[PDB]
Paper text:
However, the interface seen in MvicOBP3 is not recapitulated with NribOBP3. Instead the three chains in NribOBP3 are in a filament generated by an approximate three fold screw axis perpendicular to the crystallographic three-fold screw (Angles 117.9, 122.4 and 119.8 degrees and translations of 28.9–29.3 Å summing to the a and b axis length). This contact involves some of the same residues as the symmetric putative protein interface contact in MvicOBP3 (Arg4, Phe5, Thr7 and Tyr30), but buries a much smaller area (average 608 Å2) and would not form a closed dimer assembly. NribOBP3 has a Ki value of 5.2 μM for Eβf, 20.2 μM for (−)-α-pinene and 30.7 μM for β-pinene. In contrast NribOBP3 binds to Eβf with a lower affinity than does MvicOBP3 and has even lower affinity to the pinenes, which is consistent with the fact that [name] does not use pinenes as its alarm signal. On the other hand, for NribOBP3/Eβf, the Eβf interacts more weakly with Tyr30, Arg4, Tyr105 and Ala109 with fewer contacts and has only one direct interaction with the aromatic ring of Tyr105. In contrast, the MD analysis for NribOBP3 shows that Tyr30 is not significantly displaced. The most likely explanation is that Tyr30 is involved in the crystal packing/dimerisation in MvicOBP3 and is relaxing towards its probable monomeric conformation more like that seen in NribOBP3. It is also possible that these differences between the OBP structures are because of the different crystallisation pHs (NribOBP3 has been crystallised at pH 5.0 whereas MvicOBP3 at pH 7.5).
Numbering used by the authors: 1 to 118
């Protein structure tokens, strides 16, 4: 189990963020675009899902709700376990760090790591 989005999810949320075609192709290949806004597509996407607040910080309640909505095959216990761990790490991260486009990938990595610990 990982946090990867499906092709279709990427297409839909990518287009909701007005992705350029070239960037979109890259994101669908699970790589990070090198363009100024392409590298921020993941941030834009997960923010529309409510996983992050608008300042970029981790949204605890919004992460829980989004996990339940989009990964409903995971039990609420498993959702809460990985949420509780990642949230606590996110309390250590300042305003200037959460503002970076890379922070979204750091959050997804935390989740993926907690998923592998099962």
């Amino acid at each position: 189990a990982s946090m990867r989005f499906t092709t279709e999810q990427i297409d839909y949320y990518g287009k909701a963020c007005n992705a350029s075609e070239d960037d979109l192709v890259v994101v669908k290949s699970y790589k990070v675009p090198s363009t100024e806004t392409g590298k921020c597509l993941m941030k834009c996407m997960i923010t529309k899902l409510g996983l992050l607040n608008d300042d970029g910080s981790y949204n605890k309640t919004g992460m829980e709700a989004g996990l339940k909505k989009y990964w409903s095959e995971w039990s609420t216990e498993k959702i809460e376990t990985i949420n509780n761990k990642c949230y606590e790490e996110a309390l250590l991260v300042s305003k200037e760090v959460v503002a970076t486009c890379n922070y979204s990938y750091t959050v997804m990595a935390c989740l993926n790591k907690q998923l592998d610990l099962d």
